[PDB]
mmCIF file of all heavy atoms in Angstrom:
data_model
loop_
_atom_site.group_PDB
_atom_site.id
_atom_site.type_symbol
_atom_site.label_atom_id
_atom_site.label_comp_id
_atom_site.label_asym_id
_atom_site.label_seq_id
_atom_site.Cartn_x
_atom_site.Cartn_y
_atom_site.Cartn_z
ATOM 1 N N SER A 36 -10.453 0.013 9.722
ATOM 2 C CA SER A 36 -11.466 0.545 8.769
ATOM 3 C C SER A 36 -12.139 -0.590 8.041
ATOM 4 O O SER A 36 -13.286 -0.475 7.673
ATOM 5 C CB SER A 36 -10.818 1.502 7.793
ATOM 6 O OG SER A 36 -10.285 2.631 8.428
ATOM 7 N N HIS A 37 -11.370 -1.641 7.706
ATOM 8 C CA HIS A 37 -11.894 -2.768 6.919
ATOM 9 C C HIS A 37 -11.274 -4.036 7.569
ATOM 10 O O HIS A 37 -10.417 -4.681 6.909
ATOM 11 C CB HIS A 37 -11.425 -2.599 5.446
ATOM 12 C CG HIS A 37 -11.806 -1.309 4.845
ATOM 13 N ND1 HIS A 37 -13.036 -1.035 4.272
ATOM 14 C CD2 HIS A 37 -11.054 -0.200 4.691
ATOM 15 C CE1 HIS A 37 -13.001 0.203 3.841
ATOM 16 N NE2 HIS A 37 -11.757 0.788 4.028
ATOM 17 N N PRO A 38 -11.873 -4.548 8.657
ATOM 18 C CA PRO A 38 -11.437 -5.683 9.314
ATOM 19 C C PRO A 38 -11.433 -6.980 8.463
ATOM 20 O O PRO A 38 -10.622 -7.930 8.826
ATOM 21 C CB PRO A 38 -12.622 -5.840 10.426
ATOM 22 C CG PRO A 38 -12.910 -4.469 10.694
ATOM 23 C CD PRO A 38 -13.008 -3.843 9.298
ATOM 24 N N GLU A 39 -12.137 -7.102 7.425
ATOM 25 C CA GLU A 39 -12.140 -8.285 6.583
ATOM 26 C C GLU A 39 -10.760 -8.460 5.965
ATOM 27 O O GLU A 39 -10.391 -9.600 5.683
ATOM 28 C CB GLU A 39 -13.226 -8.088 5.463
ATOM 29 C CG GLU A 39 -13.026 -7.031 4.445
ATOM 30 C CD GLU A 39 -13.616 -5.693 4.732
ATOM 31 O OE1 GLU A 39 -13.834 -5.346 5.948
ATOM 32 O OE2 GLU A 39 -13.976 -4.949 3.784
ATOM 33 N N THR A 40 -9.999 -7.348 5.745
ATOM 34 C CA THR A 40 -8.672 -7.444 5.101
ATOM 35 C C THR A 40 -7.753 -8.295 6.062
ATOM 36 O O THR A 40 -6.857 -8.901 5.577
ATOM 37 C CB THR A 40 -8.115 -6.078 4.903
ATOM 38 O OG1 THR A 40 -7.950 -5.354 6.117
ATOM 39 C CG2 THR A 40 -8.970 -5.259 3.981
ATOM 40 N N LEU A 41 -8.034 -8.206 7.371
ATOM 41 C CA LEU A 41 -7.214 -8.931 8.358
ATOM 42 C C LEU A 41 -7.293 -10.406 8.151
ATOM 43 O O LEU A 41 -6.331 -11.122 8.509
ATOM 44 C CB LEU A 41 -7.647 -8.461 9.753
ATOM 45 C CG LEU A 41 -6.774 -8.961 10.922
ATOM 46 C CD1 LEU A 41 -5.324 -8.583 10.673
ATOM 47 C CD2 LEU A 41 -7.302 -8.417 12.258
ATOM 48 N N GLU A 42 -8.437 -10.881 7.647
ATOM 49 C CA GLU A 42 -8.635 -12.327 7.452
ATOM 50 C C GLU A 42 -7.650 -12.925 6.443
ATOM 51 O O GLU A 42 -7.325 -14.135 6.496
ATOM 52 C CB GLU A 42 -10.029 -12.622 6.904
ATOM 53 C CG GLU A 42 -11.161 -12.287 7.907
ATOM 54 C CD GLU A 42 -12.495 -12.635 7.415
ATOM 55 O OE1 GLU A 42 -12.885 -12.277 6.259
ATOM 56 O OE2 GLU A 42 -13.284 -13.400 8.122
ATOM 57 N N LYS A 43 -7.093 -12.101 5.585
ATOM 58 C CA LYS A 43 -6.110 -12.565 4.566
ATOM 59 C C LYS A 43 -4.765 -12.895 5.175
ATOM 60 O O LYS A 43 -3.906 -13.526 4.578
ATOM 61 C CB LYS A 43 -5.936 -11.459 3.495
ATOM 62 C CG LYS A 43 -7.078 -11.330 2.539
ATOM 63 C CD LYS A 43 -7.137 -12.627 1.678
ATOM 64 C CE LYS A 43 -8.319 -12.595 0.726
ATOM 65 N NZ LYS A 43 -8.429 -13.816 -0.107
ATOM 66 N N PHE A 44 -4.591 -12.395 6.464
ATOM 67 C CA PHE A 44 -3.314 -12.651 7.181
ATOM 68 C C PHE A 44 -3.390 -13.729 8.219
ATOM 69 O O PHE A 44 -3.899 -13.423 9.315
ATOM 70 C CB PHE A 44 -2.695 -11.388 7.741
ATOM 71 C CG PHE A 44 -2.481 -10.290 6.656
ATOM 72 C CD1 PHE A 44 -3.515 -9.557 6.195
ATOM 73 C CD2 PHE A 44 -1.218 -10.113 6.173
ATOM 74 C CE1 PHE A 44 -3.296 -8.514 5.230
ATOM 75 C CE2 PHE A 44 -0.959 -9.129 5.222
ATOM 76 C CZ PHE A 44 -2.016 -8.323 4.773
ATOM 77 N N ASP A 45 -2.987 -14.934 7.924
ATOM 78 C CA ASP A 45 -3.024 -16.004 8.922
ATOM 79 C C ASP A 45 -2.170 -15.670 10.125
ATOM 80 O O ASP A 45 -2.421 -16.059 11.269
ATOM 81 C CB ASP A 45 -2.570 -17.300 8.325
ATOM 82 C CG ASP A 45 -3.571 -17.904 7.330
ATOM 83 O OD1 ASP A 45 -4.757 -17.446 7.271
ATOM 84 O OD2 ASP A 45 -3.165 -18.763 6.551
ATOM 85 N N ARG A 46 -1.094 -14.883 9.893
ATOM 86 C CA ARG A 46 -0.172 -14.398 10.922
ATOM 87 C C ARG A 46 -0.801 -13.400 11.822
ATOM 88 O O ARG A 46 -0.558 -13.304 13.047
ATOM 89 C CB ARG A 46 1.097 -13.855 10.265
ATOM 90 C CG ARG A 46 2.239 -14.937 10.190
ATOM 91 C CD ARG A 46 3.588 -14.239 10.208
ATOM 92 N NE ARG A 46 4.011 -13.671 8.915
ATOM 93 C CZ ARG A 46 4.900 -12.722 8.787
ATOM 94 N NH1 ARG A 46 5.455 -12.155 9.791
ATOM 95 N NH2 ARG A 46 5.212 -12.288 7.612
ATOM 96 N N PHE A 47 -1.657 -12.509 11.288
ATOM 97 C CA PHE A 47 -2.255 -11.408 12.042
ATOM 98 C C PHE A 47 -3.730 -11.616 12.450
ATOM 99 O O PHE A 47 -4.223 -10.739 13.154
ATOM 100 C CB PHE A 47 -2.135 -10.061 11.309
ATOM 101 C CG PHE A 47 -0.682 -9.783 10.885
ATOM 102 C CD1 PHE A 47 -0.417 -9.311 9.652
ATOM 103 C CD2 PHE A 47 0.398 -10.003 11.775
ATOM 104 C CE1 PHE A 47 0.908 -9.000 9.198
ATOM 105 C CE2 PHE A 47 1.685 -9.757 11.345
ATOM 106 C CZ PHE A 47 1.952 -9.268 10.099
#
Side-chain angles (χ1 to χ4, degrees):
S36 297
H37 308 275
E39 68 268 29
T40 62
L41 188 52
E42 294 184 312
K43 285 292 174 179
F44 300 81
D45 292 345
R46 267 207 277 157
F47 308 137

